[PDB]
Amino acid sequence: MRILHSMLRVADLEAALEFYTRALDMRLLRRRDYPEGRFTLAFVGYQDERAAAALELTHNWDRDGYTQGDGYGHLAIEVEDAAVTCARARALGYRVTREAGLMQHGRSVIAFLEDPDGYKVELIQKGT
Amino acid sequence: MRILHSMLRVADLEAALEFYTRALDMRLLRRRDYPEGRFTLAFVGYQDERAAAALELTHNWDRDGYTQGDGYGHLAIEVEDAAVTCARARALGYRVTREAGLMQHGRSVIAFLEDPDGYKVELIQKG
Ligand SMILES: [Cl-]
Ligand code: NI
Ligand SMILES: [Zn+2]
Numbered sequence: 001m002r003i004l005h006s007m008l009r010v011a012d013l014e015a016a017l018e019f020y021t022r023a024l025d026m027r028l029l030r031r032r033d034y035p036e037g038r039f040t041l042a043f044v045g046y047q048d049e050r051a052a053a054a055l056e057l058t059h060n061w062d063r064d065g066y067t068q069g070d071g072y073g074h075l076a077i078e079v080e081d082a083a084v085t086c087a088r089a090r091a092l093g094y095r096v097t098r099e100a101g102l103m104q105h106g107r108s109v110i111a112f113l114e115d116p117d118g119y120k121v122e123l124i125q126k127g128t
Numbered sequence: 129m130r131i132l133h134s135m136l137r138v139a140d141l142e143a144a145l146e147f148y149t150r151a152l153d154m155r156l157l158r159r160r161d162y163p164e165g166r167f168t169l170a171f172v173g174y175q176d177e178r179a180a181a182a183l184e185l186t187h188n189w190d191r192d193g194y195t196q197g198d199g200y201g202h203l204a205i206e207v208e209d210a211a212v213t214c215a216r217a218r219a220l221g222y223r224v225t226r227e228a229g230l231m232q233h234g235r236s237v238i239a240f241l242e243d244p245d246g247y248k249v250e251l252i253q254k255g
């Protein structure tokens with residue numbers, strides 16, 4: 001057994017893809033657009049779906065938006081340097097909700113970004 | 129770069145761990161109380177955290193529950209036999225829903241498990 005993917009609903013697939021590919025260096029693994037069902041799916045990530053868990057982005061062509069709650073937490077990504085990823089995210093005009101630094105009572109360098117839909121992305125610096 | 133985990137907040141950590149380990153055969157990889165923050169973290173999965181992305185469970189001590197939005201979808205898991213995992217989750221009292229005609233899954237009927245907090249788990253038969 002293995003974890004395949006986490007699925008999130010997005011209001012604007014192109015805006016979501018611009019975030020994951022540019023700010024996070026993910027590549028588009030697979031995309032399927034279904035005119036019959038009026039929805040699109042896009043799997044983004046770092047490794048092939050066969051090798052690792054990916055991020056599934058779902059776009060309902062007729063849904064303008066989604067309501068966020070407090071149940072879903074975040075997607076965490078391992079980065080070489082968290083300050084660098086934050087500065088790159090800011091240069092692209094993406095939201096850094098928590099700048100890189102050691103978290104509360106730990107030696108872990110962490111940072112938080114928000115994707116265009118408001119989903120939290122946790123950056124954890126390699127060495128933690 | 130790599131995906132480390134997906135995080136879900138749970139109202140009852142023990143109920144949640146009972147579901148992930150018994151219904152889904154996940155291993156409890158790591159678990160830690162954070163008394164200053166008044167929360168506990170649990171990491172469940174099938175492989176070592178250094179080798180694969182896991183599922184992070186957050187239990188806030190002073191909370192009874194969460195308000196689920198409609199954006200969050202599901203967590204998909206690869207299984208050896210979806211019918212067996214389904215029949216096992218049912219025996220334990222967990223809800224199983226099945227969907228036919230999902231154009232993204234061809235001719236496959238896909239089963240979805242419902243966890244104690246109402247989060248959906250997509251079952252994908254290996255192959
Ligand atoms: Cl749209
Ligand atoms: Ni996390
Ligand atoms: Zn899925």
Ligand SMILES: [Zn+2]
Pocket residue numbers: 230232233238250
């Ligand atoms: Zn699916």
